[PDB]
Design an enzyme around this catalytic site. Structure first.
Site, PDB file in Angstrom:
ATOM      1  N   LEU A  36       0.939  -1.202   0.000  1.00  0.00           N
ATOM      2  CA  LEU A  36       0.000   0.000   0.000  1.00  0.00           C
ATOM      3  C   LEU A  36       0.940   1.204   0.000  1.00  0.00           C
ATOM      4  O   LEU A  36       1.620   1.409   1.034  1.00  0.00           O
ATOM      5  CB  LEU A  36      -0.780  -0.185   1.338  1.00  0.00           C
ATOM      6  CG  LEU A  36      -1.851  -1.252   1.303  1.00  0.00           C
ATOM      7  CD1 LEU A  36      -2.707  -1.353   2.555  1.00  0.00           C
ATOM      8  CD2 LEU A  36      -2.813  -0.952   0.121  1.00  0.00           C
ATOM      9  N   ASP A  37       1.075   1.941  -1.074  1.00  0.00           N
ATOM     10  CA  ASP A  37       2.060   3.044  -1.195  1.00  0.00           C
ATOM     11  C   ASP A  37       1.466   4.417  -1.499  1.00  0.00           C
ATOM     12  O   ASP A  37       1.015   4.745  -2.646  1.00  0.00           O
ATOM     13  CB  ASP A  37       3.046   2.611  -2.311  1.00  0.00           C
ATOM     14  CG  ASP A  37       4.247   3.493  -2.401  1.00  0.00           C
ATOM     15  OD1 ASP A  37       4.367   4.530  -1.704  1.00  0.00           O
ATOM     16  OD2 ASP A  37       5.159   3.132  -3.158  1.00  0.00           O
ATOM     17  N   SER A  38       1.440   5.228  -0.449  1.00  0.00           N
ATOM     18  CA  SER A  38       0.878   6.584  -0.496  1.00  0.00           C
ATOM     19  C   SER A  38       1.713   7.541  -1.315  1.00  0.00           C
ATOM     20  O   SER A  38       1.236   8.579  -1.779  1.00  0.00           O
ATOM     21  CB  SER A  38       0.578   7.094   0.936  1.00  0.00           C
ATOM     22  OG  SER A  38       1.804   7.356   1.602  1.00  0.00           O
TER      23      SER A  38
ATOM     24  N   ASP B  37       5.108   9.053   2.594  1.00  0.00           N
ATOM     25  CA  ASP B  37       5.381   7.834   1.804  1.00  0.00           C
ATOM     26  C   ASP B  37       5.455   6.562   2.611  1.00  0.00           C
ATOM     27  O   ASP B  37       6.539   6.201   3.142  1.00  0.00           O
ATOM     28  CB  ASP B  37       6.671   8.170   1.048  1.00  0.00           C
ATOM     29  CG  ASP B  37       6.835   7.171  -0.126  1.00  0.00           C
ATOM     30  OD1 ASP B  37       6.107   6.169  -0.102  1.00  0.00           O
ATOM     31  OD2 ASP B  37       7.710   7.468  -0.927  1.00  0.00           O
TER      32      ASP B  37
END
Lengths: 112, 111
Positions: A36-38, B37
């Site tokens: 899961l990469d914001s 991130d």
């Protein structure tokens, strides 16, 4: 989906990928692990996880020719509602669910 | 901190960096903007954001001094500061990794 951010452990989930195209393929569905990469604008399947007969088009990154159905699986085996995307394919350390997918699941980053 | 995940918006925050070492520096605290991130194991400040008299030890480099990091919300409220030795590298935007995320008590959720 609810995952606590931990320094030492990556926010990894199991995902079911389903090729929905008309082109014939060996396996219609595969299981993978993805982060899961914001910080990623879009979803990228690693070259390692992408089925060899699933076609790609020159979007370094290639892009799925076909529409893929993405099923995020919760740690307890429960399923999130599926998404329809055209993921990128590249040489990355592992598969990444970007913000296109995070948004589709209605996720937020919070400490509240 | 509460931030909706959107494809079109990068989850950017304002940050205050404070060098806690002994030696003199031109500017002890600076304001930068950085990305949240969850895909990053470690916090990384771009060389462009990193003050030149702030020492690094030996592609990435690690800060020799302990750095206090304070996230500032859009409305200006301050989150609790964290102590870390960030990495410095040729990236085009500073990144707050899970070292900061965890310190902040964040979670990714639709619940």
């Amino acid at each position: 989906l609810a995952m606590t951010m931990e320094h030492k452990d990556r926010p990894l989930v199991r995902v079911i990928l389903t090729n929905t195209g008309s082109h014939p393929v060996k396996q219609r569905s595969v299981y993978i692990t993805a982060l899961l990469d914001s910080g990623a604008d879009i979803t990228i399947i690693s070259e390692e996880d992408w089925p060899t007969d699933w076609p790609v088009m020159e979007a370094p990154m290639r892009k799925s020719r076909d529409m893929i159905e993405v099923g995020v699986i919760n740690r307890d085996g429960s399923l999130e509602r599926p998404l329809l995307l055209f993921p990128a394919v590249a040489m990355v350390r592992g598969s990444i669910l970007g913000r296109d997918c995070l948004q589709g699941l209605g996720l937020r980053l919070t400490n509240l």
